[PDB]
């Protein structure tokens, strides 16, 4: 139940987890519904993530990587200003070590396929297919929108496009990178990344 | 007009999550030195 309770990823996770828990219940004192920490899920399906060479990788490839989703728009001037800074942070931060440190997945708020692909040609990190519903599920899960189109359920718009969200293995909001938030640090909030403390395990 | 939905989470709501408990299991295992066996071997049996 993190960051929220009313999100499609959370409700699907709850359905699958307590379906499995009930199944083991009549197969066998067990606790119903299961505790959120006991609950486990697959955050990205088999054919979701795609790299710069258009080859799919599974979720197990993100292990040991401080991974962050990047909600972005091709035509948005904040995203156009932010993208070289995020690019150079990824570049330098990954170059300067004997180990992979940070990794970025790209979630698109862009209007259509051609502009999404033209935007994706500039990003050197992983991305999610636009017609994959996982983008909409992640947008509703982490409460990001340009404008109120999908109804939030008494919750808030946690961030506007663009945003960088450090995530966990179970969809936990590990930390917020305050590019457009109540703190408003444009292009230098990226340095608040505690990549030592947060790793995709 | 839409309603700007309230994003907000206080200090008391944000900045601590339940930590894992510290892993402590270590006593002070001291190997006892064996009592050094005693011959300040006494007078009667010692000389006569």
UniProtKB/TrEMBL annotation, chain A:
Residues covered by the Thioredoxin-like fold domain: 64-172
GO CC annotations, alphabetized: nucleus
Top-level division of the source organism's lineage: Eukaryota
One GO molecular-function entry: thioredoxin-disulfide reductase (NADPH) activity
SUPFAM superfamilies linked: Thioredoxin-like
Name of a matching Pfam family: Thioredoxin_8
One BP annotation, GO: negative regulation of Wnt signaling pathway
Name of the protein: PDI family protein
Natural source organism: Toxoplasma gondii
Lineage: Eukaryota, Sar, Alveolata, Apicomplexa, Conoidasida
From TrEMBL, chain B:
Family designation: Belongs to the FAM154 family.
Name recorded for this polypeptide: Microtubule associated protein SPM1
């Amino acid at each position: 139940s993190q960051p929220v309770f009313a999100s499609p990823l959370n409700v699907e996770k709850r359905r699958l987890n307590e379906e499995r828990a009930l199944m083991q219940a009549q197969k066998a004192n067990i606790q119903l519904p299961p505790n959120y920490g006991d609950m486990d899920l697959i955050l990205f399906p088999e054919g979701s993530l795609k790299n710069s060479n258009n080859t799919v990788i599974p979720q197990s490839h993100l292990k040991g990587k401080s991974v962050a989703l990047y909600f972005a728009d091709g035509a948005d001037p904040k995203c156009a200003s932010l993208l070289p800074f995020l690019l150079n942070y990824y570049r330098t931060m990954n170059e300067g070590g004997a180990n992979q440190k940070i990794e970025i997945i790209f979630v698109s708020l862009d209007r259509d396929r051609e502009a999404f692909e033209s935007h994706r040609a500039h990003m050197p990190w992983l991305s999610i297919d636009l017609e994959n519903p996982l983008t909409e599920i992640l947008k509703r899960h982490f409460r990001v929108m340009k404008e109120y189109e999908v109804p939030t359920y008494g919750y808030g718009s946690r961030t506007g496009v663009p945003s960088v969200i450090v995530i966990g293995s179970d969809g936990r909001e590990a930390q917020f990178l305050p590019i457009c938030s109540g703190l408003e640090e444009g292009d230098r909030a990226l340095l608040r990344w505690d990549w030592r403390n947060t790793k995709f395990a | 007009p839409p309603t700007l939905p309230f994003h907000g989470e206080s200090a008391y709501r944000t900045d601590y999550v339940p930590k894992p408990l510290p892993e402590v299991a270590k006593p002070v295992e001291v190997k006892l030195p064996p009592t050094l066996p005693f011959n300040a071997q006494s007078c009667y049996r010692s000389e006569y």
